[PDB]
């Protein structure tokens, strides 16, 4: 006879979830495994003889890019005989500066960085986050997408996703042709929310590259690296290859990060034994050497990886921490589904979302999950009223605020209106009035009239083959009646010439002000110090719908 | 040399920044890319840009940022497709040996792009131990 | 015990057939997806989608890499149209053409749970349609939000199992199909 | 036209709740009111003479309280003087110690206290919370209720929790007549699920000291106190009277905590225009005045109130914050629901989950909510492999482990059977074997066979009456042959013996052995100090249902 | 409106009639309960409960508290049964008696969103069975786990605003019916 | 006097809480329950007791906790009945000032609760100021 509560508990959203013992040999362990390499380095004459165990005799192309590029050599020692202990006690506590860990953090190895944040519970890993986190403000990206690749509702969604709080915007595609349509209507519906949402188009490198050479995208995050090497050429790169192609980006005056995350290497069958954390490190000293200054990680698309196996969600905040402590952006996932229970998913995102980091998520999805091209992401559109209720109950900034359904409307509106206009232009198969409304009124796909994928994808074909530039959209919203927003497009295409935003976090705010690590330095020593939630802005977080005035 | 008190470039000092081709940031107006007064080609960032915000990055505690965009500024001056064909040659098992080194020789050589230069001699050399040349997979 | 490896593929001479590429160990140490579709039946209704088409259907198993784009990028270069079907042990699928990079292709399948033997058919089908050039359109999107959430974890083992039979430097070995 | 976008909104279930903007003059507003005292204090020849801002002839008996018995006198103008930005600073800082800082809370006053933690975002007062935590050891504490108040099913559930890893247990009822028989059933089924588990019966206070009198129960909780003197006074007591139960209640024995919690004056009418947050500090102190180990509180049943408001989570934390850093054991309530909301409830638990506190909820439900007698709690019974899942995502000790059906079928029944020996012996009326299948089996009183009240209410109300004590119940175990539990249950008196278990966060564990601040000491001093969750513990949490072994 | 206070009560004779004690907005500043149910039609019921018991219905408006627990004893001094009905405006209602401390009581109803005008008829059936000592059953157990989440803020608002007319030391007041 | 040392008592000194009875805590055995040998009351906890944990408490630096358990140690001397009695008392509106007085004389002289006596004696005065009389209501 079977027990009613166990009966209860069986059919729970939470036991539908994938959970694995630990498979050490195969590095199904987030961290603290007992294969993990014991921190070490020798150097002779400027050059690193051994690394984290390995004499360079044994040097795969990783340890020799991290060895050569990512680490400060001439503090290297100095660090390695420092107590991993009171390292990390540094990093919780309020009164050691942010500017006196970096020195110490950059100049540490691979293993090294994580024994010491392995030493750290959760709660002293926020209380850690909040002041190695390189923005002084924290800050929040989504993904505009759905499952037709319609264009009039990308524009729509990303319109109110920018009105919402969104400072960067993230668009992939069903139909990998549809592309170039999905990243001018991303562009377009996000300066239509606000004039400063930076845009970019996920894609394989070369052609996300092209599209970015074309002037259809405002920088690029999903340039992926990998830490081990045989998972790094499956993924058809070496750190040389992704690293040029860093500098190809900022060539053309292209913000960009890399991206990595937990697991990537059990995922793709060769992590060498080592725990995540252990080879998510290796990814981050990637990103430092190759010169890149941010980086999206916190297990990202493989997060049903560490999450399935003990302390994987700890690992995913580890891993931030170690990235905001090694000085680089860290846009900190919150973007990809791992459990069917609001709970677990909740407790995840808070770890992020408390402390604040540079992007509390790297794809909180602004529409349904439905049309979520990722694959789900770890909030969508139906949790942005309990997001806003949580920054209220807590006083925290999470990045977004709450809006009124007209504002939504007439932004959705006008964006659709927009794109109408830029397709008329450049005579792409049109947008039609019946479009228009619906993109106004939709929640996602399913309130969109189908389109004509052939139509669509041929044009959007010649917009590559023809080489057809950014200034092209800008003419026909000038040439349409959309003058404002004709000049908002220009406006962020100028942001590509000056170099300001290709510093660390930078994101643009207010009237085209580029606020970045560099003038927006986060100075926290404690309480009452740092950023905090406060004033009008907090005035607007507290503004919730339904909260009836008392009396 | 250009410190992060000279940051943002477009508040402190936007003449610093003048394009491709000699337009600056005034120039580009609605009214000029509609009177095609500017265009694409004029919309280039350039080698000295990326240079001052190089030593802005070293002026933040940030030298490896500052040499990616050291590398950047190089590459300026290598056309959209010229950026193509050799990011894809040192993508795994692309290329041989001799054309990486005769990619870096261009560099030098067409374009004074030293430092990427010695980058893809050192992907080179690194590729051949191990092993992510043509026919090694 | 349905598929014998019978030598070293050669290439293509003719733009009739479509290469079915099958990881290392397709048919042998897995014999079903990751949702228990068997080996057999997947190769069955893939392998009848192309011949459906008036297309011929040739089957390898690849070494080099375990990853699909790899496998389907050994198939493409080996097919005769130049167009190949690559599949997992685990279920995933592509459908690739030489001329692409290897993370570039006509089609993608990159949630193996959610494939049935419908879809397996129509995507050999879809393979023979590129083959002869005719712009068939796409196999339509399954997605579903769930999918990595209920199988990420098990696709990640299945693959490291399959990953073991991986040979760096064999070349495909075409396949007798039982 | 309608945006179906709101209208999905519209429907999520977070927008069921109660949310109120601000009415500062009503005391509406959980912290930070403009309307608070500043914290002031005047001693004169030992005594207080000025305390926040009030000259001592214009006192309430809060006041005299307070100022007679709550607050360090030794260095109250010491710390007076202190910073409070700096105060709230060595709050979170992990490298002053617990020890060096209580000497310092102890002597502020209820409003300097307010003011230095309010300084504090909530990431800070949850490394502030995990140093001050009087226990080293966080523990938990369950309801074990049913609508029927049907003793079988208390006894069964009442098991069930106990092996989950609950080290305290609360009853209540449905029908106050039938309290004693809920108390004997929650104490049986109790020891029999993990012998040194301690219980209340929670009622009226003269009601509720008589049951303990009569040794139905090892301990009391629900001893009321109020932050304003008109609400003090509809609570029926003052701080004499509820001082003098206090003591009442060690004089035979009997381990005690208050009970007090943001939003009772609120909820109560008079606010007397001050934060819910100062009013709670006001509380707190009396407690300590009194001479009380610790308190129950973070708004408990009156959650509806600081929720509905800004920041009244984070107000609830703090609340929390000040009892631990009195000095006061803290039972942190995550005990009543206040939300429709997974996402939401998940939050405002894990602020106290998170660190750790005495016990991470004074409450979590040990039944399904429907069966839940205090009107629901913020966890139940259905949550219970959410929170061993989150346990094991983030290594965080929650004080419960996963557990094995086969286990907790077999412990239900022996403690059913117990409860149908004693009610034997006692001749009270009977428990048929059908029940107890019924009990074994069941999730909840829907799975109960119905029960003659008027019986049971009967000889209920006669326990009481006739004073039959807990030696009635020994006997009956002894007699029926239940002597191990009788020797257990003989043990919870011996314990009641010794005045061991009476001091500050004193429970019992293994074989009867106390554990409490006094034995088990807080040593917290940052990364890889204080309490780990490790070893065995870790390797019991790592054990949830459906963890696949990946070979 | 529908209540005529009729001088200060006096003191009961027949242990035969069941005071309902008001609070002290009750049909004033208040006139339904925190669901919408009318003052009015709430009395309607209490009173037709008792009344088809056979027993008197007195009504009374407290104002030395506006607790309901407090202002039900008030009702129990006076009540010649002893037997009392202590309501809130917002709804809340308790079954008192002399010789029970005020926080304890006959019957509570601690979830007012839950009473129906059914449940307000059976409260006062019940009170008058209790008045007769006749030991009725007790009214059936209403709870709901979201009801707090839903009306606790609420519920205070109403009761803050209540609160604003208690008179210190004032006697409750006799009240004169529709 | 006791020390934290000392303590748990059940541990370090459990001769310590020999009843004043003079039995162990050996004594208390379900067999001695059985038999009679052991009773109600000899599992009540002695003032004895209470005044070792107070001195534990305030070792611990915890001196209000000390003072509770040293109003406990005098509590043991009073009747159940009789605590009720005195809490009800001290409710807001149930005595009079000489009611309470009359209680705390009572106190002190049967039952030597000097420190009790003391604090209702407190109470009784600031009953009158705030007005938690009987008849203040
Ligand atoms: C998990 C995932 C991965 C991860 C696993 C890949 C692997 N090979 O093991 C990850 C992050 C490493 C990854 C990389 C890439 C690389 C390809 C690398 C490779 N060799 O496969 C990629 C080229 C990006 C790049 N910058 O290079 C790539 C792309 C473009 C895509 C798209 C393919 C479009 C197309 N070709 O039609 C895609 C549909 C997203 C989109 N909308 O564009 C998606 C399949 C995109 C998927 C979105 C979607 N709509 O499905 C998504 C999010 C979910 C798939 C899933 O979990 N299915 C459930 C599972 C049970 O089913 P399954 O059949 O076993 O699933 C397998 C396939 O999906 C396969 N697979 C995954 N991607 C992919 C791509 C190609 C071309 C092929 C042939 C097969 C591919 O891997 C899984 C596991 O075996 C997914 N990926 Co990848 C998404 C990339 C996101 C940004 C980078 N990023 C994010 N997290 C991290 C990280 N921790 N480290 C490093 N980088 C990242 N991906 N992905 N991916
Ligand atoms: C919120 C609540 C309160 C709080 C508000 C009371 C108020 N007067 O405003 C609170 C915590 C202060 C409180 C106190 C008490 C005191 C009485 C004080 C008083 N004057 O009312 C109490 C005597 C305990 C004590 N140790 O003294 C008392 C008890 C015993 C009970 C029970 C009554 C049994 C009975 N008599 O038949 C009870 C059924 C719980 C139980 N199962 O035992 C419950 C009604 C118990 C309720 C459980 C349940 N089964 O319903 C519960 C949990 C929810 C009710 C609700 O939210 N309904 C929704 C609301 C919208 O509807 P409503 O009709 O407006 O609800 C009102 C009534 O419930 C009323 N009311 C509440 N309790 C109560 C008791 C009596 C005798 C009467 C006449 C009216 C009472 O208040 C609310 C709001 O106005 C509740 N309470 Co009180 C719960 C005590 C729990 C532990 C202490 N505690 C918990 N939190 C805190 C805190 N932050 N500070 C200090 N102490 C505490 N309670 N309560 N309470
Ligand atoms: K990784
Ligand atoms: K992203
Ligand atoms: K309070
Ligand atoms: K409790």
Request: glycine share 8%; charged share 25%.
């Given at each position: ?97 942010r500017?006196?860990?970096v ?29 190695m986190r390189a923005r002084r ?156 200054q941010g ?28 990235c905001s402590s090694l000085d680089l952006e860290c ?26 980091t540079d ?144 510093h660390t976090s ?10 970045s690590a560099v003038?927006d330095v986060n ?29 | ?137 | ?178």
């Amino acid at each position: 006879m079977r027990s009613k509560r166990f009966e209860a508990l069986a059919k729970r959203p939470v036991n539908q979830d994938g959970f694995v013992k630990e498979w050490i040999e195969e590095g199904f362990i987030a961290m603290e495994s007992p294969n993990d390499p014991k921190p070490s380095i020798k150097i002779v004459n400027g050059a690193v003889t051994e690394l984290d165990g390995k004499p360079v005799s044994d040097f795969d192309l990783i340890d020799h890019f991290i060895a050569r590029y990512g680490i400060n050599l001439n503090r290297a020692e100095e660090v390695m005989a420092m107590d991993s202990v009171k390292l990390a006690n540094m990093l919780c506590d309020p009164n050691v500066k942010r500017s006196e860990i970096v020195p110490l953090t950059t100049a540490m190895t691979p293993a090294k960085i994580v024994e010491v944040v392995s030493h750290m519970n959760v709660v002293e890993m926020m209380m850690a986050m909040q002041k190695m986190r390189a923005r002084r403000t924290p800050s929040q990206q989504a993904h505009v997408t759905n499952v037709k690749d319609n264009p009039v509702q990308i524009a729509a969604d990303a319109a109110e996703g920018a009105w919402r709080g969104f400072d960067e915007q993230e668009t992939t595609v069903a139909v990998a042709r549809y592309a170039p349509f999905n990243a001018i209507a991303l562009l377009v519906g996000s300066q239509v929310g606000r004039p400063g949402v930076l845009t970019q188009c996920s894609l394989e490198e070369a052609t996300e590259l092209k599209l970015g050479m074309l002037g259809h995208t405002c920088y690029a995050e999903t340039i992926s690296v990998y830490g081990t090497e045989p998972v790094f050429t499956d993924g058809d790169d070496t750190p040389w290859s992704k690293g040029f192609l860093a500098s190809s980006y900022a060539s053309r005056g292209l913000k960009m990060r890399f991206t990595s995350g937990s697991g990537s290497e059990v995922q793709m069958g060769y992590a060498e034994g080592k725990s995540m954390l252990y080879l998510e490190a290796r990814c981050i000293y990637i990103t430092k050497a190759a010169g890149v200054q941010g980086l999206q990680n916190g297990s990202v698309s493989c997060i049903g990886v560490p999450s399935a196996v003990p302390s994987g969600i700890r690992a995913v905040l580890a891993e931030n921490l170690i990235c905001s402590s090694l000085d680089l952006e860290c846009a900190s996932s919150n973007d990809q589904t791992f459990t069917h229970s609001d709970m677990r998913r909740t407790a995840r995102l808070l770890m992020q979302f408390l402390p604040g980091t540079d992007f509390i998520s790297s794809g909180y999805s602004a529409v349904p999950n439905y049309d979520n091209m990722f694959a789900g992401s770890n909030e969508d559109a139906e949790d942005f009223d309990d997001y806003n209720v949580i920054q209220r109950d807590l006083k925290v900034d999470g990045g977004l605020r709450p809006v009124r359904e007209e504002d939504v409307i007439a932004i959705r509106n006008k964006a659709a209106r927009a794109l109408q206009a830029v397709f008329a232009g450049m005579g792409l198969p049109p947008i039609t009035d019946e479009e228009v409304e619906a993109a106004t009124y939709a929640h996602g796909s399913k309130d969109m009239p189908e389109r004509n994928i052939v139509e669509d994808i041929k044009f959007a074909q010649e917009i590559i083959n023809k080489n057809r530039n950014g200034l092209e959209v800008v003419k026909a919203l000038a040439q349409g009646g959309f003058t404002d927003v004709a000049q908002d497009m220009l406006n962020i295409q100028k942001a590509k010439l000056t170099g300001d935003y290709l510093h660390t976090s930078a994101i643009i705010v207010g009237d085209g002000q580029v606020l970045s690590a560099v003038n927006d330095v986060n100075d926290y020593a404690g309480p009452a110090t740092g950023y905090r939630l406060q004033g009008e802005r907090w005035e607007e977080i507290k503004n919730i719908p339904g909260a009836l005035d008392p009396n | 040399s250009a410190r992060v008190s000279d940051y943002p470039l477009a508040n402190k000092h936007p003449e610093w920044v003048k394009t491709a081709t000699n337009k600056t940031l005034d120039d580009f107006t609605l009214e000029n890319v509609l009177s095609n007064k500017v265009t694409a080609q004029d919309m280039r960032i350039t080698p000295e840009t990326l240079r001052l915000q190089a030593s802005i990055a070293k002026d933040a505690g940030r030298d490896r940022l500052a040499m990616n965009f050291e590398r950047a500024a190089e590459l300026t001056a290598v056309p959209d497709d010229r950026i193509l064909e050799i990011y894809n040659a040192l993508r795994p098992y692309r290329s041989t040996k001799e054309e990486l080194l005769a990619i870096a020789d261009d560099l030098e050589s067409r374009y004074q792009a030293k430092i990427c230069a010695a980058f893809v001699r050192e992907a080179a050399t690194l590729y051949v131990e191990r092993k992510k040349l043509k026919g090694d997979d | 015990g349905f598929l014998t490896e019978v030598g070293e593929a050669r290439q293509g001479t003719q733009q009739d057939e479509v290469i079915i590429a099958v990881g290392p160990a397709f048919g042998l140490a897995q014999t079903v997806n990751i949702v228990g579709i068997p080996h057999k039946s997947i190769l069955r209704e893939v392998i009848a989608g192309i011949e459906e088409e008036g297309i011929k259907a040739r089957v390898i198993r690849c070494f080099k890499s375990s990853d699909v784009a790899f496998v389907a990028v050994e198939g493409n270069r080996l097919s005769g149209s130049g167009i190949s079907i690559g599949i997992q042990s685990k279920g995933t699928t592509v459908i690739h053409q030489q001329g692409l990079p290897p993370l570039s292709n006509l089609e993608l399948f990159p949630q193996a749970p959610l494939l049935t033997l419908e879809t397996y058919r129509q995507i050999g089908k879809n393979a023979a349609r590129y083959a002869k050039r005719e712009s068939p359109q796409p196999v339509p999107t399954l997605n579903d939000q769930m999918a990595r959430p209920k199988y990420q974890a098990k696709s990640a083992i299945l693959h490291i199992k399959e990953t073991k039979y991986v040979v760096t430097g064999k070349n495909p070995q075409e396949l007798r199909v039982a």
